[PDB]
């Protein structure tokens, strides 16, 4: 019993994060293989200052051993520190990029030393709700899928209302941003529905039955509902996604909607699920079957 | 900015998972140099849960009976003995990826990161808090005792939980890794139930300050009370009662936020009373207790 916010044990990736140093700015950077990944704003037109940097003007730091830069080059808003020595603990990884609503855990990092885990979604408005301070840039954002770490962010920058931005292991950015200093904003965010109603089941499953219904709904009316509240159009694969969990409680997808929508129309009246008296979206239906049957990595 | 329920890194606590079986009983056990340390109850044969004699279980166990298994390799038990709920399995090699480390027996109140585990293996790692009622609200499944707790403040690791238990309430009780329980629990089937908890005042209090520090004074209002009111009314939401000692530790965040304490606890009290009406603070429609004064400082500050 229970439910927490879980992260994946960042273990595998404590093993990678190093220091990057250049000038006067220093921030994280992941190190796999002999590639050092960090923000290319360590260093605007970015070829232009690229070219006036050689490799020993990049200052690596992978513990208290100084690794020596023996190439650069850039790959969109990621910076890629060839260095000469490959990274014993690199883990089994992949880069992947990331859709909204998916979740993942941050090793929040400074001076490539990691402080904290969090679990945290790619929200709507492709910004993240972090907890990051100056120096945090560099960071990085994974999932875990059995003994293959999946990198799919890396931390940039912080936008003026507290929230994050930042790019996949590629250099993308997620949301219409930009590394450079001027006017940006998050755009008005929604409330992640498949991930609400993978929530609403992992209450189920906990014993928490009192928002549940006779009631079902029409994928239409409840996206008509759903568009008033800010929430996310719920798809058919949202639905088919959702499936297993439907089968384990007894509760349909459309049936577990309604309850959704009573929660809307009426709120919680005074009752909390899980210990929130807010509907939880950072919970995806993988998540909570992950945690609810306790696979392990 | 932004404020998050954050765990510790876990790497240190995962290269010292290992899985202990013991007849059909298998659970976590944490390796530290060549010891392994596991909860006691792996020798009960759930048939003598009720009533278990522990020293009596133990003395017709023979080292061959313990199976420990890190990784993919079988390390050799040399030794055991116990130390109160706890058993310690001596082994023939000592865990190379030992950290600097100690043992610590924390109070309520006080925050943790727990790395669940089942078969030795490492699954997810959450922040929880010691419940003033000595319980944990974790989240486990059959096979997650011996799961640990800890902190890791600097390159230290200080463990501080042993998961023993779930109670019929879905909450968990452990011991410290000397083997000690937090609380009044038994290692024993027999009927235990947490008694009423209670919401940790300090860490509230704690968690205001994060949240002036993060911009938002919405719920500051122009009064403060004497110590003795704010428990008086404390005491009716059935909060802990705040003490000079948490008064004294909440100086810091009052310093850099220039609220006084008792102007932070006039701030509960209207809290407590009118609710927070459609409105949240970091992120949350609930008051927030799992973040200690210490935790608010080391996320805010660094
Ligand atoms: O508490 C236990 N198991 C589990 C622990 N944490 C979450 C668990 C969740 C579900 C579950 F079925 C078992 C879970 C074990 C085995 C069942 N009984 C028992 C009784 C006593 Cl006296 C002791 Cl010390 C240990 C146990
Ligand atoms: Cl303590």
New interface residues.
């Given amino acids: 019993?229970?439910?927490?916010?879980?992260?994946?044990?960042?273990?595998?990736v404590?093993?990678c994060m190093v220091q990057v140093t250049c000038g006067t700015t220093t921030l994280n950077g992941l190190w796999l293989d002999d590639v050092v990944y960090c923000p290319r704003h360590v260093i605007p037109n970015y070829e232009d200052l690229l070219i006036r940097k050689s490799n020993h003007n990049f200052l690596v730091q992978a513990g208290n051993v100084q690794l020596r830069v023996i190439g650069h080059s850039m790959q969109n808003c990621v910076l890629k520190l060839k260095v000469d020595t490959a990274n014993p603990k690199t883990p089994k990884y992949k880069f992947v990029r990331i859709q909204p609503g998916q979740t993942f855990s941050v090793?929040?990092c400074?001076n490539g030393s990691?402080?904290?885990?969090?679990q945290?979604a790619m929200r709507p408005n492709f910004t993240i709700?972090?907890?990051?301070?100056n120096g945090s840039c560099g960071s990085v954002g994974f999932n875990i899928d059995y003994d293959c770490v999946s990198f799919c962010y890396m931390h940039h920058m912080?936008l003026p209302t507290?929230?994050?931005a930042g790019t996949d292991l590629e250099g993308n950015f997620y949301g219409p941003f930009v590394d450079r200093q001027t006017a940006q904003a998050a755009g008005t965010d929604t409330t992640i529905t498949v991930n609400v109603l993978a929530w609403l089941y992992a209450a189920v499953i906990?014993?928490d039955r009192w928002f549940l219904n006779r009631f079902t709904t029409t994928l239409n009316d409840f996206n008509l509902v759903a568009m008033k509240y800010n929430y996310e159009p719920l798809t058919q694969d949202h639905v088919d996604i959702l499936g297993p969990l439907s089968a384990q409680t007894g509760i349909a997808v459309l049936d577990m909607c309604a309850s959704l929508k009573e929660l809307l129309q009426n709120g919680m009246n005074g009752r909390?699920i899980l210990?929130?008296?807010?509907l939880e979206d950072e919970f995806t239906p993988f998540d909570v079957v992950?945690?609810?049957?306790?696979?392990?990595?």
């Fill in positions: 019993s229970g439910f927490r916010k879980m992260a994946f044990p960042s273990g595998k404590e093993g090793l929040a400074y990691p402080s904290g885990v969090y945290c709700k972090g907890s990051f301070l912080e507290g929230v994050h906990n014993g909390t210990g929130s008296a807010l992950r945690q609810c049957s306790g696979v392990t990595f």
